[PDB]
Amino acid sequence: PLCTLRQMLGEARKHKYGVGAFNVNNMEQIQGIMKAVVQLKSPVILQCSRGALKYSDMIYLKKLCEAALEKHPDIPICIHLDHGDTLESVKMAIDLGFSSVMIDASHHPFDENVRITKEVVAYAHARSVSVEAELGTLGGIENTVQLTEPQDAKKFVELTGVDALAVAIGTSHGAYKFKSESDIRLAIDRVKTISDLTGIPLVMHGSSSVPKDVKDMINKYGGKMPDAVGVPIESIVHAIGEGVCKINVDSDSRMAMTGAIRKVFVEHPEKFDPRDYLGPGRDAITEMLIPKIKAFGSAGHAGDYKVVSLEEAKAWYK
Amino acid sequence: PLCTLRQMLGEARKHKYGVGAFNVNNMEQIQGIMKAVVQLKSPVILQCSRGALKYSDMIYLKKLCEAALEKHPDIPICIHLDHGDTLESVKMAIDLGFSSVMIDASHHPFDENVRITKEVVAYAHARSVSVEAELGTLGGIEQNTVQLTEPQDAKKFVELTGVDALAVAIGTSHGAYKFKSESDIRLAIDRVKTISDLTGIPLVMHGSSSVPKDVKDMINKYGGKMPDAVGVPIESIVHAIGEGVCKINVDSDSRMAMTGAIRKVFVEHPEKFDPRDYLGPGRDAITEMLIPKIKAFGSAGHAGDYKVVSLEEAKAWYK
Ligand SMILES: O=c1c(O)c(CCOP(=O)(O)O)ccn1CP(=O)(O)O
Ligand SMILES: O=c1c(O)c(CCOP(=O)(O)O)ccn1CP(=O)(O)O
Ligand SMILES: [Zn+2]
């Protein structure tokens, strides 16, 4: 059933497991994810950026999500707005029936962040909707990146009331996180500190692994993504043990789908039925996600708890 | 709103135009089609094969259709089951809120065809849902066993079964290779007017992708191997339309528009790996392929010609 981020990650924290949070944009991507988490009876976060919502004209993604909720009433499923910039987009996602939002004001100074966030928290928590926010900014370390300062994090969380905090520890968006693979520099030491000080679920953004299998595959069949590196996966398992409950994953899927398509295009240039290549692309998503969910630790946990509806979530906030 | 096949094709018939029936499989496909008919204020048939229902575990495809019915309340939108094989496949779709079904018994003898149909007609008509059936089999004319529609048989078929619209066999077939070349186009469109006169109902043309130049050329320019693809010329279809063909089934053209678009992105920008980066283009190319096609069929500008009768109130036409 439609779950809050609050409860879902509540349970993650408790059992020391992480829940992958997977960006979806069309029918085949949701189906690729759902396949993976149903098989392993895992809770799931399906997340849509404002761009996802624009691309699917909003209503299309809503209905596709309603389809995954109806198809699998056993799974806790949290529909999350990824990277809200404004109260405006937070509203739009709420009215679409999302059970969570993220307000990303990490780029304004601390007080403006806190300002902008309280505003969304006041709004969202009225309907039972969870709120992820972020302190610190994304980007590698190797410069204008602010890594989360744990003592500020504590205050930020007390000041704002958010259910989850996204941290900055040297991860960025996209397929090109680090220049070499020798020099992967993560600041995961502070994760345990941030988790302890705030007492809430933490979120890792830019968490794709850029797995070599898929990478070479793209380049092998016409693609041009040569020096692409991601975050190593034991780093993510380490951060999970230290308090990370939500693992944001988008690029890895993008690549899985694209690799399976280029492959059909090369091997069978005579085929033009989109089912012929989109189908293989769906299944590539599933295959790539299965080990990942297993490493995260969320597998088997789908039936642990009674999902609280948004109506009842309003009570947590009064 | 949701609209029966009876009303959509009844209006098409009376005004002498045809409505394109487009096969749907996923989000970027429904969107491509809907952007087109919306821009041209045309009615639409969104059709689902059994195989497209498989592809999408039904509910996903159900829900996309809802999103379009809801996003565009202005447009009359018939949800139609294409190529129903059994009576049970029909049941499954009426319940997914379809406004219309095809029962395809064209490979059985007349009497077994009429029987299998009247069965689907009885079940469907009672829930206000429209039924398309077919007399004659698809296949190219150029040893033969293709069974072109005999206008005398068609008269008797509609008198027996009571179907809302009739798919006829005039020399088309499915897919990208309908004829041996662009000069060898052998179609049987002269019977259309006689089938339309004798039966008095809307007719449907299956296998009617046109394989336009731009789509084929882009597949073949960007790594594709489809050098001998050939479809139905739009001229033939417009001929057929004005003699009584009111519904035109198009699928391969959309499949080809999508693939070309992705192959060109794959070649012009090999760095790009976000599926939105190529499926968006693939959505847009669908839309652009379909604009001239919709206008030729003639349904452009007709979305607000009529107030749409509910499945519910359709239960009276038959009773
Ligand atoms: O976590 C995320 C994430 O939330 C987004 C959303 C922004 O996407 P948009 O382009 O706006 O639709 C993208 C990437 N990653 C992590 P990675 O997979 O790049 O490591
Ligand atoms: O008329 C039809 C039609 O009814 C279908 C449905 C079958 O599709 P499936 O492969 O079963 O999902 C497809 C194509 N055409 C005409 P064309 O586009 O091949 O010219
Ligand atoms: Zn992110």
Ligand SMILES: [Zn+2]
């Ligand atoms: Zn057909």
